[PDB]
Amino acid sequence: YKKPVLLYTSNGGHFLRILPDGTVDGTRDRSDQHIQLQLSAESVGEVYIKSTETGQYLAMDTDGLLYGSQTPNEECLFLERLEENHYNTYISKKHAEKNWFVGLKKNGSVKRGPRTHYGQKAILFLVLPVS
């Protein structure tokens, strides 16, 4: 959590991106300004995910859609969970009982919460600290 990180999924080989207009998607461009993220932990295993460039927070709405919020609240808290020792997954804490994950489709668009589950490539992120 000390360094900014990139979150990479092998589903379509995308980095999680929070665009300045509040749109969330994926890009293969590792030099994109808006894929530089900062994780911060409330409690152990509970994180905010923030754009280092814009300060916006990752959030998930009641339809399971990801978007960027200028400031955080309970809709921005995610449960960070280890899978297969090397990947992290992120579950909406607000919708933890719906098992709604942060995920990206192969085409780089957001995979909505309702369509996600453990073990999907879409939700498996490699956390890459920035040098």
Short mmCIF file of the N, C-alpha and C atoms (twelve columns), coordinates in Angstrom:
data_MODEL
# 
_entry.id   MODEL 
# 
loop_
_atom_site.group_PDB 
_atom_site.id 
_atom_site.type_symbol 
_atom_site.label_atom_id 
_atom_site.label_alt_id 
_atom_site.label_comp_id 
_atom_site.label_asym_id 
_atom_site.label_seq_id 
_atom_site.Cartn_x 
_atom_site.Cartn_y 
_atom_site.Cartn_z 
_atom_site.pdbx_PDB_model_num 
ATOM 1   N N  . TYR A 1   0.813   -1.213  0.000   1 
ATOM 2   C CA . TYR A 1   0.000   0.000   0.000   1 
ATOM 3   C C  . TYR A 1   0.852   1.270   0.000   1 
ATOM 4   N N  . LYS A 2   2.148   1.116   0.245   1 
ATOM 5   C CA . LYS A 2   3.034   2.271   0.372   1 
ATOM 6   C C  . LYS A 2   3.342   2.921   -0.979  1 
ATOM 7   N N  . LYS A 3   3.469   2.103   -2.018  1 
ATOM 8   C CA . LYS A 3   3.727   2.617   -3.357  1 
ATOM 9   C C  . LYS A 3   2.463   2.577   -4.215  1 
ATOM 10  N N  . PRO A 4   2.359   3.498   -5.186  1 
ATOM 11  C CA . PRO A 4   1.330   3.329   -6.211  1 
ATOM 12  C C  . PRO A 4   1.508   2.009   -6.949  1 
ATOM 13  N N  . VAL A 5   0.416   1.490   -7.484  1 
ATOM 14  C CA . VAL A 5   0.437   0.197   -8.139  1 
ATOM 15  C C  . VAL A 5   -0.363  0.255   -9.420  1 
ATOM 16  N N  . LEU A 6   -0.100  -0.700  -10.307 1 
ATOM 17  C CA . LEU A 6   -0.982  -0.999  -11.428 1 
ATOM 18  C C  . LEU A 6   -1.729  -2.282  -11.091 1 
ATOM 19  N N  . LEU A 7   -2.996  -2.369  -11.497 1 
ATOM 20  C CA . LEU A 7   -3.755  -3.603  -11.359 1 
ATOM 21  C C  . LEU A 7   -3.991  -4.205  -12.742 1 
ATOM 22  N N  . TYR A 8   -3.405  -5.372  -12.975 1 
ATOM 23  C CA . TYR A 8   -3.421  -6.019  -14.282 1 
ATOM 24  C C  . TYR A 8   -4.225  -7.301  -14.269 1 
ATOM 25  N N  . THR A 9   -5.129  -7.459  -15.230 1 
ATOM 26  C CA . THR A 9   -5.844  -8.727  -15.369 1 
ATOM 27  C C  . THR A 9   -5.515  -9.415  -16.692 1 
ATOM 28  N N  . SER A 10  -5.292  -10.721 -16.632 1 
ATOM 29  C CA . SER A 10  -4.981  -11.493 -17.819 1 
ATOM 30  C C  . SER A 10  -6.183  -11.735 -18.711 1 
ATOM 31  N N  . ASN A 11  -7.364  -11.282 -18.298 1 
ATOM 32  C CA . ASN A 11  -8.544  -11.613 -19.085 1 
ATOM 33  C C  . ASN A 11  -8.391  -11.139 -20.538 1 
ATOM 34  N N  . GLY A 12  -8.200  -9.839  -20.732 1 
ATOM 35  C CA . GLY A 12  -7.757  -9.310  -22.020 1 
ATOM 36  C C  . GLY A 12  -6.426  -8.561  -21.932 1 
ATOM 37  N N  . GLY A 13  -5.726  -8.728  -20.818 1 
ATOM 38  C CA . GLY A 13  -4.414  -8.110  -20.647 1 
ATOM 39  C C  . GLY A 13  -4.478  -6.627  -20.344 1 
ATOM 40  N N  . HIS A 14  -5.485  -6.231  -19.565 1 
ATOM 41  C CA . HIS A 14  -5.726  -4.825  -19.276 1 
ATOM 42  C C  . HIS A 14  -5.317  -4.380  -17.880 1 
ATOM 43  N N  . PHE A 15  -4.912  -3.116  -17.801 1 
ATOM 44  C CA . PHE A 15  -4.766  -2.409  -16.540 1 
ATOM 45  C C  . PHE A 15  -6.058  -1.676  -16.229 1 
ATOM 46  N N  . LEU A 16  -6.467  -1.716  -14.968 1 
ATOM 47  C CA . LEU A 16  -7.645  -0.997  -14.501 1 
ATOM 48  C C  . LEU A 16  -7.389  0.506   -14.585 1 
ATOM 49  N N  . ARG A 17  -8.331  1.233   -15.182 1 
ATOM 50  C CA . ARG A 17  -8.147  2.655   -15.464 1 
ATOM 51  C C  . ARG A 17  -9.327  3.441   -14.932 1 
ATOM 52  N N  . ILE A 18  -9.046  4.555   -14.271 1 
ATOM 53  C CA . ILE A 18  -10.108 5.454   -13.841 1 
ATOM 54  C C  . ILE A 18  -9.911  6.763   -14.591 1 
ATOM 55  N N  . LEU A 19  -10.719 6.954   -15.629 1 
ATOM 56  C CA . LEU A 19  -10.618 8.137   -16.482 1 
ATOM 57  C C  . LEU A 19  -11.097 9.391   -15.761 1 
ATOM 58  N N  . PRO A 20  -10.623 10.570  -16.202 1 
ATOM 59  C CA . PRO A 20  -10.973 11.824  -15.522 1 
ATOM 60  C C  . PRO A 20  -12.462 12.121  -15.533 1 
ATOM 61  N N  . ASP A 21  -13.211 11.589  -16.500 1 
ATOM 62  C CA . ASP A 21  -14.652 11.843  -16.542 1 
ATOM 63  C C  . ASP A 21  -15.436 10.891  -15.644 1 
ATOM 64  N N  . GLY A 22  -14.727 10.063  -14.879 1 
ATOM 65  C CA . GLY A 22  -15.384 9.143   -13.960 1 
ATOM 66  C C  . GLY A 22  -15.694 7.779   -14.556 1 
ATOM 67  N N  . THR A 23  -15.359 7.596   -15.828 1 
ATOM 68  C CA . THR A 23  -15.520 6.303   -16.489 1 
ATOM 69  C C  . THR A 23  -14.434 5.357   -16.004 1 
ATOM 70  N N  . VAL A 24  -14.776 4.086   -15.816 1 
ATOM 71  C CA . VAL A 24  -13.778 3.070   -15.498 1 
ATOM 72  C C  . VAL A 24  -13.718 2.075   -16.647 1 
ATOM 73  N N  . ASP A 25  -12.514 1.704   -17.066 1 
ATOM 74  C CA . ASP A 25  -12.359 0.667   -18.078 1 
ATOM 75  C C  . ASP A 25  -10.977 0.032   -17.948 1 
ATOM 76  N N  . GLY A 26  -10.569 -0.699  -18.981 1 
ATOM 77  C CA . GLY A 26  -9.249  -1.291  -19.016 1 
ATOM 78  C C  . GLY A 26  -8.479  -0.827  -20.230 1 
ATOM 79  N N  . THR A 27  -7.164  -0.743  -20.085 1 
ATOM 80  C CA . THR A 27  -6.309  -0.459  -21.222 1 
ATOM 81  C C  . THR A 27  -5.041  -1.300  -21.146 1 
ATOM 82  N N  . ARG A 28  -4.510  -1.670  -22.306 1 
ATOM 83  C CA . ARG A 28  -3.224  -2.349  -22.363 1 
ATOM 84  C C  . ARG A 28  -2.058  -1.380  -22.250 1 
ATOM 85  N N  . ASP A 29  -2.341  -0.080  -22.314 1 
ATOM 86  C CA . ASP A 29  -1.283  0.938   -22.304 1 
ATOM 87  C C  . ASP A 29  -0.679  1.138   -20.915 1 
ATOM 88  N N  . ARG A 30  0.500   0.568   -20.685 1 
ATOM 89  C CA . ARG A 30  1.100   0.618   -19.358 1 
ATOM 90  C C  . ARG A 30  1.588   2.015   -18.984 1 
ATOM 91  N N  . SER A 31  1.610   2.921   -19.954 1 
ATOM 92  C CA . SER A 31  2.079   4.277   -19.695 1 
ATOM 93  C C  . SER A 31  0.923   5.256   -19.524 1 
ATOM 94  N N  . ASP A 32  -0.303  4.735   -19.547 1 
ATOM 95  C CA . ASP A 32  -1.480  5.554   -19.336 1 
ATOM 96  C C  . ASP A 32  -1.414  6.246   -17.969 1 
ATOM 97  N N  . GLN A 33  -1.704  7.544   -17.933 1 
ATOM 98  C CA . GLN A 33  -1.619  8.308   -16.687 1 
ATOM 99  C C  . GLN A 33  -2.667  7.869   -15.664 1 
ATOM 100 N N  . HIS A 34  -3.746  7.271   -16.146 1 
ATOM 101 C CA . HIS A 34  -4.891  7.025   -15.291 1 
ATOM 102 C C  . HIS A 34  -5.006  5.585   -14.799 1 
ATOM 103 N N  . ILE A 35  -3.963  4.790   -15.026 1 
ATOM 104 C CA . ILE A 35  -3.933  3.437   -14.473 1 
ATOM 105 C C  . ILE A 35  -3.032  3.371   -13.231 1 
ATOM 106 N N  . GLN A 36  -2.402  4.487   -12.878 1 
ATOM 107 C CA . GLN A 36  -1.589  4.528   -11.667 1 
ATOM 108 C C  . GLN A 36  -2.488  4.652   -10.447 1 
ATOM 109 N N  . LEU A 37  -2.548  3.607   -9.634  1 
ATOM 110 C CA . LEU A 37  -3.514  3.570   -8.544  1 
ATOM 111 C C  . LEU A 37  -2.818  3.520   -7.197  1 
ATOM 112 N N  . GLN A 38  -3.531  3.944   -6.166  1 
ATOM 113 C CA . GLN A 38  -3.026  3.875   -4.805  1 
ATOM 114 C C  . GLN A 38  -4.040  3.130   -3.953  1 
ATOM 115 N N  . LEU A 39  -3.582  2.069   -3.309  1 
ATOM 116 C CA . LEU A 39  -4.415  1.326   -2.391  1 
ATOM 117 C C  . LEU A 39  -4.197  1.860   -0.990  1 
ATOM 118 N N  . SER A 40  -5.270  1.991   -0.220  1 
ATOM 119 C CA . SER A 40  -5.113  2.334   1.186   1 
ATOM 120 C C  . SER A 40  -6.077  1.512   2.008   1 
ATOM 121 N N  . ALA A 41  -5.610  1.012   3.144   1 
ATOM 122 C CA . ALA A 41  -6.423  0.088   3.915   1 
ATOM 123 C C  . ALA A 41  -7.102  0.752   5.103   1 
ATOM 124 N N  . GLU A 42  -8.427  0.667   5.132   1 
ATOM 125 C CA . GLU A 42  -9.200  0.988   6.323   1 
ATOM 126 C C  . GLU A 42  -8.841  0.015   7.439   1 
ATOM 127 N N  . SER A 43  -9.480  -1.142  7.378   1 
ATOM 128 C CA . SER A 43  -9.143  -2.279  8.210   1 
ATOM 129 C C  . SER A 43  -8.336  -3.243  7.353   1 
ATOM 130 N N  . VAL A 44  -7.778  -4.285  7.965   1 
ATOM 131 C CA . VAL A 44  -7.022  -5.265  7.197   1 
ATOM 132 C C  . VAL A 44  -7.952  -5.931  6.189   1 
ATOM 133 N N  . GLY A 45  -7.536  -5.937  4.928   1 
ATOM 134 C CA . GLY A 45  -8.315  -6.558  3.870   1 
ATOM 135 C C  . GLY A 45  -9.443  -5.694  3.334   1 
ATOM 136 N N  . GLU A 46  -9.553  -4.456  3.814   1 
ATOM 137 C CA . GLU A 46  -10.522 -3.499  3.268   1 
ATOM 138 C C  . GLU A 46  -9.745  -2.340  2.684   1 
ATOM 139 N N  . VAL A 47  -9.932  -2.053  1.399   1 
ATOM 140 C CA . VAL A 47  -9.142  -0.998  0.768   1 
ATOM 141 C C  . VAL A 47  -9.987  0.012   -0.002  1 
ATOM 142 N N  . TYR A 48  -9.489  1.243   -0.058  1 
ATOM 143 C CA . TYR A 48  -9.889  2.187   -1.094  1 
ATOM 144 C C  . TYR A 48  -8.910  2.058   -2.245  1 
ATOM 145 N N  . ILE A 49  -9.403  2.265   -3.461  1 
ATOM 146 C CA . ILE A 49  -8.577  2.218   -4.667  1 
ATOM 147 C C  . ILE A 49  -8.684  3.557   -5.359  1 
ATOM 148 N N  . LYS A 50  -7.596  4.313   -5.378  1 
ATOM 149 C CA . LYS A 50  -7.655  5.702   -5.801  1 
ATOM 150 C C  . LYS A 50  -6.730  5.987   -6.993  1 
ATOM 151 N N  . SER A 51  -7.175  6.855   -7.898  1 
ATOM 152 C CA . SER A 51  -6.328  7.348   -8.975  1 
ATOM 153 C C  . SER A 51  -5.269  8.303   -8.429  1 
ATOM 154 N N  . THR A 52  -3.994  8.001   -8.632  1 
ATOM 155 C CA . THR A 52  -2.975  8.941   -8.158  1 
ATOM 156 C C  . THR A 52  -2.994  10.229  -8.983  1 
ATOM 157 N N  . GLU A 53  -3.468  10.142  -10.221 1 
ATOM 158 C CA . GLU A 53  -3.486  11.304  -11.111 1 
ATOM 159 C C  . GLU A 53  -4.614  12.288  -10.784 1 
ATOM 160 N N  . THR A 54  -5.821  11.767  -10.565 1 
ATOM 161 C CA . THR A 54  -7.005  12.614  -10.360 1 
ATOM 162 C C  . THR A 54  -7.521  12.601  -8.930  1 
ATOM 163 N N  . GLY A 55  -7.087  11.623  -8.146  1 
ATOM 164 C CA . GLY A 55  -7.576  11.478  -6.784  1 
ATOM 165 C C  . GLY A 55  -8.910  10.756  -6.687  1 
ATOM 166 N N  . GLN A 56  -9.531  10.464  -7.827  1 
ATOM 167 C CA . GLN A 56  -10.844 9.804   -7.822  1 
ATOM 168 C C  . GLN A 56  -10.764 8.397   -7.245  1 
ATOM 169 N N  . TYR A 57  -11.837 7.984   -6.599  1 
ATOM 170 C CA . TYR A 57  -11.927 6.670   -5.989  1 
ATOM 171 C C  . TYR A 57  -12.740 5.721   -6.842  1 
ATOM 172 N N  . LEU A 58  -12.300 4.470   -6.921  1 
ATOM 173 C CA . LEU A 58  -13.108 3.435   -7.537  1 
ATOM 174 C C  . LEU A 58  -14.385 3.240   -6.716  1 
ATOM 175 N N  . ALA A 59  -15.529 3.121   -7.384  1 
ATOM 176 C CA . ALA A 59  -16.788 2.883   -6.687  1 
ATOM 177 C C  . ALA A 59  -17.639 1.922   -7.494  1 
ATOM 178 N N  . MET A 60  -18.567 1.247   -6.830  1 
ATOM 179 C CA . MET A 60  -19.496 0.386   -7.551  1 
ATOM 180 C C  . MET A 60  -20.928 0.767   -7.193  1 
ATOM 181 N N  . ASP A 61  -21.755 0.992   -8.212  1 
ATOM 182 C CA . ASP A 61  -23.137 1.426   -7.975  1 
ATOM 183 C C  . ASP A 61  -24.060 0.233   -7.712  1 
ATOM 184 N N  . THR A 62  -25.348 0.507   -7.506  1 
ATOM 185 C CA . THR A 62  -26.284 -0.549  -7.124  1 
ATOM 186 C C  . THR A 62  -26.637 -1.490  -8.274  1 
ATOM 187 N N  . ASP A 63  -26.146 -1.196  -9.474  1 
ATOM 188 C CA . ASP A 63  -26.318 -2.101  -10.602 1 
ATOM 189 C C  . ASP A 63  -25.057 -2.908  -10.863 1 
ATOM 190 N N  . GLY A 64  -24.052 -2.716  -10.017 1 
ATOM 191 C CA . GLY A 64  -22.801 -3.431  -10.165 1 
ATOM 192 C C  . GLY A 64  -21.837 -2.778  -11.131 1 
ATOM 193 N N  . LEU A 65  -22.105 -1.532  -11.519 1 
ATOM 194 C CA . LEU A 65  -21.217 -0.853  -12.452 1 
ATOM 195 C C  . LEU A 65  -20.135 -0.084  -11.719 1 
ATOM 196 N N  . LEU A 66  -18.911 -0.196  -12.215 1 
ATOM 197 C CA . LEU A 66  -17.791 0.564   -11.683 1 
ATOM 198 C C  . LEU A 66  -17.779 1.963   -12.237 1 
ATOM 199 N N  . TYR A 67  -17.426 2.921   -11.392 1 
ATOM 200 C CA . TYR A 67  -17.222 4.277   -11.850 1 
ATOM 201 C C  . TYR A 67  -16.246 4.945   -10.893 1 
ATOM 202 N N  . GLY A 68  -15.826 6.155   -11.238 1 
ATOM 203 C CA . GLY A 68  -14.923 6.920   -10.401 1 
ATOM 204 C C  . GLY A 68  -15.679 8.004   -9.660  1 
ATOM 205 N N  . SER A 69  -15.419 8.103   -8.361  1 
ATOM 206 C CA . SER A 69  -16.050 9.089   -7.500  1 
ATOM 207 C C  . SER A 69  -15.000 10.091  -7.044  1 
ATOM 208 N N  . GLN A 70  -15.341 11.374  -7.056  1 
ATOM 209 C CA . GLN A 70  -14.384 12.388  -6.636  1 
ATOM 210 C C  . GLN A 70  -13.995 12.203  -5.172  1 
ATOM 211 N N  . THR A 71  -14.955 11.843  -4.323  1 
ATOM 212 C CA . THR A 71  -14.652 11.604  -2.915  1 
ATOM 213 C C  . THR A 71  -15.236 10.261  -2.487  1 
ATOM 214 N N  . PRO A 72  -14.679 9.667   -1.424  1 
ATOM 215 C CA . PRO A 72  -15.079 8.300   -1.067  1 
ATOM 216 C C  . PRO A 72  -16.216 8.194   -0.055  1 
ATOM 217 N N  . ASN A 73  -16.896 7.056   -0.072  1 
ATOM 218 C CA . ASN A 73  -17.792 6.671   1.008   1 
ATOM 219 C C  . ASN A 73  -17.873 5.153   1.015   1 
ATOM 220 N N  . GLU A 74  -18.913 4.603   1.637   1 
ATOM 221 C CA . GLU A 74  -19.032 3.159   1.783   1 
ATOM 222 C C  . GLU A 74  -19.099 2.425   0.440   1 
ATOM 223 N N  . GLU A 75  -19.534 3.119   -0.613  1 
ATOM 224 C CA . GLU A 75  -19.617 2.494   -1.929  1 
ATOM 225 C C  . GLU A 75  -18.246 2.360   -2.592  1 
ATOM 226 N N  . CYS A 76  -17.217 2.893   -1.940  1 
ATOM 227 C CA . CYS A 76  -15.869 2.871   -2.490  1 
ATOM 228 C C  . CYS A 76  -14.963 1.905   -1.757  1 
ATOM 229 N N  . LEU A 77  -15.488 1.245   -0.729  1 
ATOM 230 C CA . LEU A 77  -14.684 0.315   0.052   1 
ATOM 231 C C  . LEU A 77  -14.724 -1.070  -0.585  1 
ATOM 232 N N  . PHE A 78  -13.556 -1.675  -0.776  1 
ATOM 233 C CA . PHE A 78  -13.488 -3.004  -1.365  1 
ATOM 234 C C  . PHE A 78  -12.764 -3.978  -0.457  1 
ATOM 235 N N  . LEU A 79  -13.243 -5.213  -0.480  1 
ATOM 236 C CA . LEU A 79  -12.613 -6.313  0.229   1 
ATOM 237 C C  . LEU A 79  -11.535 -6.903  -0.656  1 
ATOM 238 N N  . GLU A 80  -10.290 -6.821  -0.203  1 
ATOM 239 C CA . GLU A 80  -9.155  -7.347  -0.939  1 
ATOM 240 C C  . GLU A 80  -8.947  -8.789  -0.536  1 
ATOM 241 N N  . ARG A 81  -9.005  -9.702  -1.492  1 
ATOM 242 C CA . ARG A 81  -8.905  -11.124 -1.144  1 
ATOM 243 C C  . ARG A 81  -7.911  -11.837 -2.047  1 
ATOM 244 N N  . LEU A 82  -6.998  -12.576 -1.425  1 
ATOM 245 C CA . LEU A 82  -5.963  -13.308 -2.150  1 
ATOM 246 C C  . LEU A 82  -6.519  -14.533 -2.870  1 
ATOM 247 N N  . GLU A 83  -6.087  -14.751 -4.110  1 
ATOM 248 C CA . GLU A 83  -6.453  -15.969 -4.834  1 
ATOM 249 C C  . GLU A 83  -5.228  -16.557 -5.525  1 
ATOM 250 N N  . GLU A 84  -5.013  -17.854 -5.314  1 
ATOM 251 C CA . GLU A 84  -3.868  -18.577 -5.875  1 
ATOM 252 C C  . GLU A 84  -2.547  -17.891 -5.572  1 
ATOM 253 N N  . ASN A 85  -2.495  -17.277 -4.391  1 
ATOM 254 C CA . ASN A 85  -1.299  -16.708 -3.776  1 
ATOM 255 C C  . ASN A 85  -0.699  -15.492 -4.452  1 
ATOM 256 N N  . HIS A 86  -0.923  -15.335 -5.749  1 
ATOM 257 C CA . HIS A 86  -0.257  -14.251 -6.458  1 
ATOM 258 C C  . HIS A 86  -1.198  -13.178 -6.969  1 
ATOM 259 N N  . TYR A 87  -2.498  -13.463 -6.949  1 
ATOM 260 C CA . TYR A 87  -3.498  -12.515 -7.448  1 
ATOM 261 C C  . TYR A 87  -4.327  -11.942 -6.318  1 
ATOM 262 N N  . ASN A 88  -4.799  -10.719 -6.506  1 
ATOM 263 C CA . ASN A 88  -5.786  -10.170 -5.604  1 
ATOM 264 C C  . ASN A 88  -7.109  -9.963  -6.307  1 
ATOM 265 N N  . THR A 89  -8.188  -10.150 -5.558  1 
ATOM 266 C CA . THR A 89  -9.531  -9.875  -6.042  1 
ATOM 267 C C  . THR A 89  -10.142 -8.810  -5.134  1 
ATOM 268 N N  . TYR A 90  -11.110 -8.073  -5.667  1 
ATOM 269 C CA . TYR A 90  -11.689 -6.939  -4.956  1 
ATOM 270 C C  . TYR A 90  -13.211 -7.028  -4.995  1 
ATOM 271 N N  . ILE A 91  -13.810 -7.212  -3.827  1 
ATOM 272 C CA . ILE A 91  -15.264 -7.357  -3.713  1 
ATOM 273 C C  . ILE A 91  -15.858 -6.073  -3.147  1 
ATOM 274 N N  . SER A 92  -16.905 -5.546  -3.770  1 
ATOM 275 C CA . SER A 92  -17.623 -4.420  -3.173  1 
ATOM 276 C C  . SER A 92  -18.026 -4.743  -1.742  1 
ATOM 277 N N  . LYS A 93  -17.551 -3.956  -0.776  1 
ATOM 278 C CA . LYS A 93  -17.926 -4.251  0.600   1 
ATOM 279 C C  . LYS A 93  -19.424 -4.006  0.786   1 
ATOM 280 N N  . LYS A 94  -19.927 -2.947  0.171   1 
ATOM 281 C CA . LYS A 94  -21.347 -2.641  0.281   1 
ATOM 282 C C  . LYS A 94  -22.199 -3.793  -0.252  1 
ATOM 283 N N  . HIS A 95  -21.711 -4.458  -1.293  1 
ATOM 284 C CA . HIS A 95  -22.467 -5.538  -1.926  1 
ATOM 285 C C  . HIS A 95  -21.779 -6.883  -1.755  1 
ATOM 286 N N  . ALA A 96  -21.082 -7.043  -0.633  1 
ATOM 287 C CA . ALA A 96  -20.319 -8.252  -0.368  1 
ATOM 288 C C  . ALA A 96  -21.190 -9.514  -0.445  1 
ATOM 289 N N  . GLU A 97  -22.445 -9.382  -0.022  1 
ATOM 290 C CA . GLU A 97  -23.408 -10.487 -0.003  1 
ATOM 291 C C  . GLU A 97  -23.943 -10.807 -1.392  1 
ATOM 292 N N  . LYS A 98  -23.650 -9.936  -2.351  1 
ATOM 293 C CA . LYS A 98  -23.995 -10.206 -3.736  1 
ATOM 294 C C  . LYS A 98  -22.784 -10.774 -4.486  1 
ATOM 295 N N  . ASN A 99  -21.638 -10.854 -3.810  1 
ATOM 296 C CA . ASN A 99  -20.398 -11.331 -4.431  1 
ATOM 297 C C  . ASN A 99  -20.049 -10.559 -5.702  1 
ATOM 298 N N  . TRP A 100 -20.133 -9.244  -5.616  1 
ATOM 299 C CA . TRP A 100 -19.866 -8.404  -6.768  1 
ATOM 300 C C  . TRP A 100 -18.399 -7.955  -6.776  1 
ATOM 301 N N  . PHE A 101 -17.660 -8.391  -7.791  1 
ATOM 302 C CA . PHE A 101 -16.229 -8.135  -7.890  1 
ATOM 303 C C  . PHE A 101 -15.942 -6.985  -8.839  1 
ATOM 304 N N  . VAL A 102 -14.802 -6.352  -8.624  1 
ATOM 305 C CA . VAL A 102 -14.164 -5.532  -9.641  1 
ATOM 306 C C  . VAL A 102 -13.708 -6.440  -10.762 1 
ATOM 307 N N  . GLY A 103 -14.133 -6.171  -11.996 1 
ATOM 308 C CA . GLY A 103 -13.716 -7.018  -13.089 1 
ATOM 309 C C  . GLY A 103 -13.718 -6.317  -14.428 1 
ATOM 310 N N  . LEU A 104 -12.886 -6.815  -15.330 1 
ATOM 311 C CA . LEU A 104 -12.794 -6.303  -16.682 1 
ATOM 312 C C  . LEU A 104 -13.037 -7.416  -17.687 1 
ATOM 313 N N  . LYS A 105 -13.852 -7.128  -18.702 1 
ATOM 314 C CA . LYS A 105 -14.055 -8.036  -19.822 1 
ATOM 315 C C  . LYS A 105 -12.841 -8.079  -20.749 1 
ATOM 316 N N  . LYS A 106 -12.778 -9.096  -21.602 1 
ATOM 317 C CA . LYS A 106 -11.665 -9.224  -22.545 1 
ATOM 318 C C  . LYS A 106 -11.509 -8.010  -23.460 1 
ATOM 319 N N  . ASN A 107 -12.609 -7.315  -23.751 1 
ATOM 320 C CA . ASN A 107 -12.532 -6.140  -24.611 1 
ATOM 321 C C  . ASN A 107 -12.219 -4.844  -23.850 1 
ATOM 322 N N  . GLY A 108 -11.856 -4.966  -22.577 1 
ATOM 323 C CA . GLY A 108 -11.449 -3.813  -21.797 1 
ATOM 324 C C  . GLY A 108 -12.577 -3.024  -21.175 1 
ATOM 325 N N  . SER A 109 -13.821 -3.447  -21.376 1 
ATOM 326 C CA . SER A 109 -14.908 -2.752  -20.701 1 
ATOM 327 C C  . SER A 109 -15.155 -3.420  -19.342 1 
ATOM 328 N N  . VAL A 110 -15.785 -2.696  -18.426 1 
ATOM 329 C CA . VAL A 110 -16.072 -3.239  -17.098 1 
ATOM 330 C C  . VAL A 110 -17.011 -4.446  -17.163 1 
ATOM 331 N N  . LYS A 111 -16.684 -5.486  -16.406 1 
ATOM 332 C CA . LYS A 111 -17.620 -6.592  -16.236 1 
ATOM 333 C C  . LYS A 111 -18.468 -6.275  -15.015 1 
ATOM 334 N N  . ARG A 112 -19.781 -6.123  -15.203 1 
ATOM 335 C CA . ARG A 112 -20.671 -5.729  -14.108 1 
ATOM 336 C C  . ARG A 112 -20.645 -6.735  -12.961 1 
ATOM 337 N N  . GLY A 113 -20.768 -6.223  -11.736 1 
ATOM 338 C CA . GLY A 113 -20.784 -7.054  -10.537 1 
ATOM 339 C C  . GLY A 113 -21.595 -8.342  -10.634 1 
ATOM 340 N N  . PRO A 114 -22.860 -8.237  -11.058 1 
ATOM 341 C CA . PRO A 114 -23.730 -9.416  -11.181 1 
ATOM 342 C C  . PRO A 114 -23.179 -10.532 -12.061 1 
ATOM 343 N N  . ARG A 115 -22.282 -10.217 -12.991 1 
ATOM 344 C CA . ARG A 115 -21.708 -11.251 -13.849 1 
ATOM 345 C C  . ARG A 115 -20.361 -11.798 -13.374 1 
ATOM 346 N N  . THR A 116 -19.916 -11.397 -12.191 1 
ATOM 347 C CA . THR A 116 -18.602 -11.832 -11.712 1 
ATOM 348 C C  . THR A 116 -18.709 -12.947 -10.669 1 
ATOM 349 N N  . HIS A 117 -17.597 -13.647 -10.434 1 
ATOM 350 C CA . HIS A 117 -17.463 -14.621 -9.341  1 
ATOM 351 C C  . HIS A 117 -15.991 -14.995 -9.154  1 
ATOM 352 N N  . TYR A 118 -15.660 -15.620 -8.023  1 
ATOM 353 C CA . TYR A 118 -14.293 -16.096 -7.785  1 
ATOM 354 C C  . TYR A 118 -13.796 -16.965 -8.925  1 
ATOM 355 N N  . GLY A 119 -12.498 -16.886 -9.199  1 
ATOM 356 C CA . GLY A 119 -11.884 -17.725 -10.211 1 
ATOM 357 C C  . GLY A 119 -11.953 -17.229 -11.648 1 
ATOM 358 N N  . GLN A 120 -12.809 -16.246 -11.927 1 
ATOM 359 C CA . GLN A 120 -12.860 -15.644 -13.263 1 
ATOM 360 C C  . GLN A 120 -11.565 -14.909 -13.551 1 
ATOM 361 N N  . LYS A 121 -11.009 -15.084 -14.748 1 
ATOM 362 C CA . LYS A 121 -9.864  -14.278 -15.145 1 
ATOM 363 C C  . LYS A 121 -10.191 -12.792 -15.043 1 
ATOM 364 N N  . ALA A 122 -11.448 -12.437 -15.326 1 
ATOM 365 C CA . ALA A 122 -11.887 -11.036 -15.301 1 
ATOM 366 C C  . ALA A 122 -11.618 -10.334 -13.975 1 
ATOM 367 N N  . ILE A 123 -11.606 -11.092 -12.883 1 
ATOM 368 C CA . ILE A 123 -11.539 -10.493 -11.551 1 
ATOM 369 C C  . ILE A 123 -10.195 -10.729 -10.870 1 
ATOM 370 N N  . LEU A 124 -9.310  -11.455 -11.541 1 
ATOM 371 C CA . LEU A 124 -8.028  -11.799 -10.955 1 
ATOM 372 C C  . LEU A 124 -7.007  -10.743 -11.324 1 
ATOM 373 N N  . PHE A 125 -6.553  -9.963  -10.344 1 
ATOM 374 C CA . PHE A 125 -5.584  -8.908  -10.635 1 
ATOM 375 C C  . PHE A 125 -4.184  -9.185  -10.096 1 
ATOM 376 N N  . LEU A 126 -3.197  -8.903  -10.938 1 
ATOM 377 C CA . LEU A 126 -1.813  -8.889  -10.512 1 
ATOM 378 C C  . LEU A 126 -1.487  -7.483  -10.065 1 
ATOM 379 N N  . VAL A 127 -1.086  -7.321  -8.809  1 
ATOM 380 C CA . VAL A 127 -0.784  -5.995  -8.299  1 
ATOM 381 C C  . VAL A 127 0.690   -5.690  -8.554  1 
ATOM 382 N N  . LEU A 128 0.942   -4.641  -9.329  1 
ATOM 383 C CA . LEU A 128 2.291   -4.308  -9.777  1 
ATOM 384 C C  . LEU A 128 2.761   -2.971  -9.220  1 
ATOM 385 N N  . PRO A 129 3.571   -3.002  -8.152  1 
ATOM 386 C CA . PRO A 129 4.078   -1.747  -7.594  1 
ATOM 387 C C  . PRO A 129 4.913   -0.968  -8.601  1 
ATOM 388 N N  . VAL A 130 4.721   0.345   -8.625  1 
ATOM 389 C CA . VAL A 130 5.463   1.213   -9.525  1 
ATOM 390 C C  . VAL A 130 6.838   1.511   -8.932  1 
ATOM 391 N N  . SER A 131 7.860   1.521   -9.781  1 
ATOM 392 C CA . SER A 131 9.224   1.786   -9.334  1 
ATOM 393 C C  . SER A 131 9.429   3.252   -8.966  1 
# 
